[PDB]
Design a protein around this nucleic acid. Structure first.
Ligand code: GSP
Ligand code: PHE
Ligand code: K
Ligand code: K
Ligand code: MG
Ligand code: MG
Ligand code: MG
Ligand code: MG
Ligand code: MG
Ligand code: MG
Ligand code: MG
Ligand code: MG
Ligand code: MG
Ligand code: MG
Ligand code: MG
Ligand code: MG
Lengths: 59, 71, 444, 65, 185
RNA sequence: CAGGCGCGCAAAUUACCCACUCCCGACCCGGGGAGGUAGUGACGAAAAAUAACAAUACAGGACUCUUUCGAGGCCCUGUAAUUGGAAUGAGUCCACUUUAAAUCCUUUAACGAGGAUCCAUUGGAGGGCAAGUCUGGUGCCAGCAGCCGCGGUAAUUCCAGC
RNA sequence: GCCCGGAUAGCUCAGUCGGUAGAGCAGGGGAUUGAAAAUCCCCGUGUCCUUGGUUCGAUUCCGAGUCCGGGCACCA
């Protein structure tokens, strides 16, 4: 017995609540962007001792 | 049904609600599924995928850049 | 050097439009003699020998086999003062759609009414198209009328003054009700089959002392149909506006490609200009502008012209699409628009959700009545009551309309030509109206 | 800085003879305002149809048109 | 049918492996210190170094009696000395193999403007160069990757028409001065 | 050679010129869609913008001294931080040059940057493979997923925001 | 542009000249399961393509239009 069908195609995309992108500053581009990465990864290295936190750590 | 030779194939339509853009008897640009003539993933025996419909890209339709040529 | 005017021939079925036009073109030199005998022999062998001059315009196999005009046909000829492009419109009510396409792109309308025993009454009856055609001509903006009573040879007695005079009195009455001032209209007794009183006065009507027209900007007098054409007032061409050219057909000329043909309404069309088509949203530079097989350097308003576009298929642009400059104010699709509509004759009651066929320029799209905004006065849009719930015949109202298929329209105020319309239903002209505001989609 | 090339002639009459025509026109010396190559080619092929001294007349009679 | 030349080549070679952490970190470190817009810039110098070091390798394979070893062996060393990556006391092909990436791109024009003291940051170096402020001998050079040679290292300085120097002021202050002249009266 | 149609997933202007390159001819003089020139051109290749600085500020290192604390100046970094006025070319636009004539490029005068809105995208974020077990929605559906696999009401993988 | 036929539940197919559209299949809700399937209970879930005409009234009567299918034609 098949539960999916062609009438319900694109269901979750339609029902997903719509949240708008918020106005934010433009990101630095080109050499300036590579400058930002260099500082965030190598210059501002705060020691942690225990274990490394990823660039996008959420814990 | 391919125009150049009249052969009949089954083409997968990618993404969430893209089948709604397609209607019956529309000109569709079709490409391979990436496995050089073999089925991809769990879809059984489908070796093709749809890239453009009604001479407009499925991605631009899915991303809201353009709309099914409404006449 | 001449002035180009667009002339539409209108009237009831079998009133002699095509014959009158074909003979008039032949007399003025628009077609070679030898071609007429080619038509004369071939029409007789098909069993339609009476359509000898009608075959000049009836080019289709179906038109020639059945002796009926189905679609408009254009031809050119010169009246020693006007370079005239004449349009032959079908007389059938089933082909009123092709009329409105041809009639829209016209500057003067010649109305052909058959002076025959019982033939005239059939045209001017309720179920005839003589009344309807004159009504649509005024609705579509044609403000210059020439009434030529045809088939005068077939009266009883032939070339009867009394028949001619009674038709003038009756036709005048109608034209006056619908807007045309009879004193500004030239009535010409003609015999399209025999070519009587079209170029030179006919001995068969010595009683006819001529026609007189009393018009502002000139009073004219004459006897023949050609002199009636020569008295047409020169139309005013809106040249200082962005380009607007409603398409009436698209052809695939061998060795040239896609050549959309249509009449430019406003602005100037020149080769090398990048034009855009609405509502199909196709932008392309024009390669050449040709009119009547003759090369052009610029298409001034009122020049029905065809033009070569680059890398455009025939299927992309169709009849009813509007062509305009991409650099200047470009035409755009209308999601909806607001109209002042006067209901003429609907048997019942008109409420929101009504979907009659709306005819604007060359576009015939079934538009849906979305909201009855308010009831206004007829002679002046003075409001009367908000939200009429329903409208019946004789009521003028403000209506918001949402077309079914994509359609490009403009307000009458900015561009008079592409705002006029006629709602059509029940095989009748239900209502007419003008367009005040257009909700153009951004298309970006 | 700006480099370049210069030619200085013994006399103007010599500069008349052995010098490119375009550089002469740059000084207004030998100016010509002629027809396009296409118009000449149109005329040349039209004259190829006719024969005799009529060749000059009809080609010249159709050149302004 | 055409008087054109189609001779062209790529100045760089992409990595064999797209996402290798150590290579990514080292390339970022280099881009960061020598102020380089993109990772293509680290690969261009890497490609030039690889071709040069590869060229030195078959020469070292050939014996010292090889005439071919001597000619382009001497020429290759001379080019390296001229651009300033090899010391004039270093006339051995064996010493080319010890060259590193930072050596070649240390000779870049943008690094020299910051080092010579013309610019106060490596990112200020590119801005000055791209804005037409630096001459080498007498010619303004707006290419940050301009490889300075020893013959021209001593001559790098501000351009004559640069407002920073014997130059009429730049447009932004010109607009303030007329404001000052208008503001005064 | 352009240009049209058809075919197709699939490929440009019905442009200007003999000035260059060279060819033919009785010929220093004529002609040449050969060829050159511009147009279209993200086929492909090369160079290279989308900021930089200075101070205040707040964490943080940093350099020294000192009750360990603490302190002072100094180097460095994150903040459409608080600003501030410097710089410039994309752009528009005299001339000039370019060139057969033009064009672009090169130069120059004017003008032209703060949200310097003059606003960089395309793909991905379980592993292979660089990057969240964040939050909302859906609930073996919708979808994803080159492969392994994810989804059956707390999805590191769908649809979204960050 | 012209002509011909069709349009009723998610699918298919019924439906009297005019007395307020059903059948099967599918699906939904509940019991059950970790979630299903099976099993056991309940539920048409459809603007009769759209819109006007006429009628006491319209899916079934007649027009206009849209889409689909078929055929014909269209050379500034
Ligand atoms: N006696 C007479 N017969 C005429 C005259 N004009 C036309 N006819 C005949 O009437 C018939 C119909 O003419 P026709 O040309 O078809 O009119 P029409 O208005 O163009 O017809 P349609 O296109 O609206 S269908 C033809 O057979 C023609 O021979 C006329 O002036 N006098
Ligand atoms: C072309 O020139 C247009 N005037 C349209 C047209 C004229 C004559 C015949 C057919 C089309
Ligand atoms: K030459
Ligand atoms: K995500
Ligand atoms: Mg598998
Ligand atoms: Mg009859
Ligand atoms: Mg006719
Ligand atoms: Mg008949
Ligand atoms: Mg007829
Ligand atoms: Mg009768
Ligand atoms: Mg020559
Ligand atoms: Mg930008
Ligand atoms: Mg991965
Ligand atoms: Mg990883
Ligand atoms: Mg959840
Ligand atoms: Mg059905």
């Amino acid at each position: 017995k098949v539960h999916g069908s062609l009438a319900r195609a694109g269901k979750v995309r339609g029902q997903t609540p719509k949240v708008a992108k918020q106005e934010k500053k433009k990101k630095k581009t080109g050499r300036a962007k590579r400058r930002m990465q260099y500082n965030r990864r190598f210059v501002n290295v705060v020691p942690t001792f225990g274990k490394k936190k990823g660039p996008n750590a959420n814990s | 049904q391919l125009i150049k030779n009249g052969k009949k194939i089954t083409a997968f339509v990618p993404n969430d609600g893209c089948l709604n853009f397609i209607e019956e008897n529309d000109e569709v640009l079709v490409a391979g599924f990436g496995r050089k003539g073999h089925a991809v993933g769990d879809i059984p025996g489908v070796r093709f995928k749809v890239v453009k419909v009604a001479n407009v890209s499925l991605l631009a339709l899915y991303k809201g850049k353009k709309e099914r040529p409404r006449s | 050097e001449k002035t180009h005017i667009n002339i539409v021939v209108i009237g009831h079925v079998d009133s002699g439009k095509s014959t009158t036009t074909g003979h008039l073109i032949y007399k003025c030199g628009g077609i070679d003699k030898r071609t007429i005998e080619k038509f004369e022999k071939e029409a007789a062998e098909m069993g339609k020998g009476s359509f000898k001059y009608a075959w000049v315009l009836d080019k289709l196999k179906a038109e020639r086999e059945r002796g009926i005009t189905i679609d408009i046909s254009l031809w050119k000829f010169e009246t020693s003062k006007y370079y005239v492009t004449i349009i032959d419109a079908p007389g059938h009510r089933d082909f009123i759609k092709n009329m409105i396409t041809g009639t829209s792109q016209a500057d003067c309308a010649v109305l052909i009414v058959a002076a025959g025993v019982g033939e005239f009454e059939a045209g001017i009856s309720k179920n005839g198209q003589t009344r309807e055609h004159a009504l649509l001509a005024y609705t579509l903006g044609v403000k210059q009328l020439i009434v030529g009573v045809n088939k005068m040879d077939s009266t009883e007695p032939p070339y009867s003054q009394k028949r001619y005079e009674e038709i003038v009195k009756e036709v005048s009455t109608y034209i006056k009700k619908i807007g045309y001032n009879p004193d500004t209209v030239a009535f010409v007794p003609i015999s399209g089959w025999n070519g009587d009183n079209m170029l030179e006065p006919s001995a068969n009507m010595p009683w006819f002392k001529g026609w007189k027209v009393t018009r502002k900007d000139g009073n004219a007098s004459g006897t023949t149909l050609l002199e009636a054409l020569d008295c047409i007032l020169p139309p005013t061409r809106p040249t200082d506006k962005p380009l607007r050219l409603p398409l009436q057909d698209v052809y695939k000329i061998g060795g040239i490609g896609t050549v959309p043909v249509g009449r430019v309404e406003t602005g100037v069309l020149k080769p090398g200009m990048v034009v855009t088509f609405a509502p199909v949203n196709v932008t392309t530079e024009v390669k050449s502008v040709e009119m009547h097989h003759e090369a052009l350097s610029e298409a001034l308003p009122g020049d029905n012209v065809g033009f070569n576009v680059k890398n455009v298929s025939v299927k992309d642009v169709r009849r009813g699409n509007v062509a305009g400059d991409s650099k200047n104010d470009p035409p755009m699709e209308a999601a909806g628009f607001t109209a002042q509509v006067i209901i003429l004759n609907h048997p019942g009651q008109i409420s929101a959700g009504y979907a009659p066929v709306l005819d604007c320029h060359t576009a015939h799209i079934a538009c849906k009545f979305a909201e009855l905004k308010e009831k206004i006065d007829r002679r002046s849009g003075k409001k009367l009551e908000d939200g009429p719930k329903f409208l019946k015949s004789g009521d003028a109202a403000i209506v918001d309309m949402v077309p079914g298929k994509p359609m490009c329209v403009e307000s009458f105020s900015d561009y008079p030509p592409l705002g006029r319309f006629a709602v059509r239903d029940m095989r009748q002209t239900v209502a007419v109206g003008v367009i005040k505001a257009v909700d153009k989609k951004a298309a970006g | 800085k700006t480099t370049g090339f210069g030619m200085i002639y013994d006399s103007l009459d010599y500069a008349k003879k052995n010098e490119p025509k375009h550089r002469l026109a740059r000084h207004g010396l030998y100016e010509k305002k002629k027809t396009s190559r296409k118009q000449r080619k149109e005329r040349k092929n039209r004259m190829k149809k006719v024969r005799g001294t009529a060749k000059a007349n009809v080609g010249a009679g159709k050149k302004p048109k | 049918p055409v008087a054109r030349s189609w001779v062209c080549r790529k100045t760089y070679v992409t990595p064999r492996r797209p996402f290798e952490k150590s290579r990514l970190d080292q390339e970022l470190k280099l881009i960061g210190e020598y102020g380089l817009r993109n990772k293509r810039e680290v690969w261009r110098v890497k490609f030039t170094l690889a071709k040069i070091r590869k060229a030195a390798r078959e020469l070292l394979t050939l014996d010292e009696k090889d005439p071919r070893r001597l000619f382009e062996g001497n020429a290759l060393l001379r080019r390296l000395v001229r651009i300033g990556v090899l010391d004039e006391g270093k006339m051995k092909l064996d010493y080319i193999l010890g060259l590193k990436i930072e050596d070649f791109l240390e000779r870049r024009l943008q690094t020299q403007v910051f080092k010579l003291g013309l610019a106060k940051s490596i990112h200020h170096a590119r801005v000055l160069i791209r804005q037409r402020h630096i001459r080498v001998r007498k010619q303004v050079v707006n290419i940050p990757s301009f490889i300075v040679r020893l013959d021209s290292q001593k001559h790098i300085d501000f351009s004559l028409r640069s407002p920073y120097g014997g130059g009429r002021p730049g447009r932004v202050k010109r607009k303030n001065a007329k404001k000052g002249q208008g503001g005064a009266g």
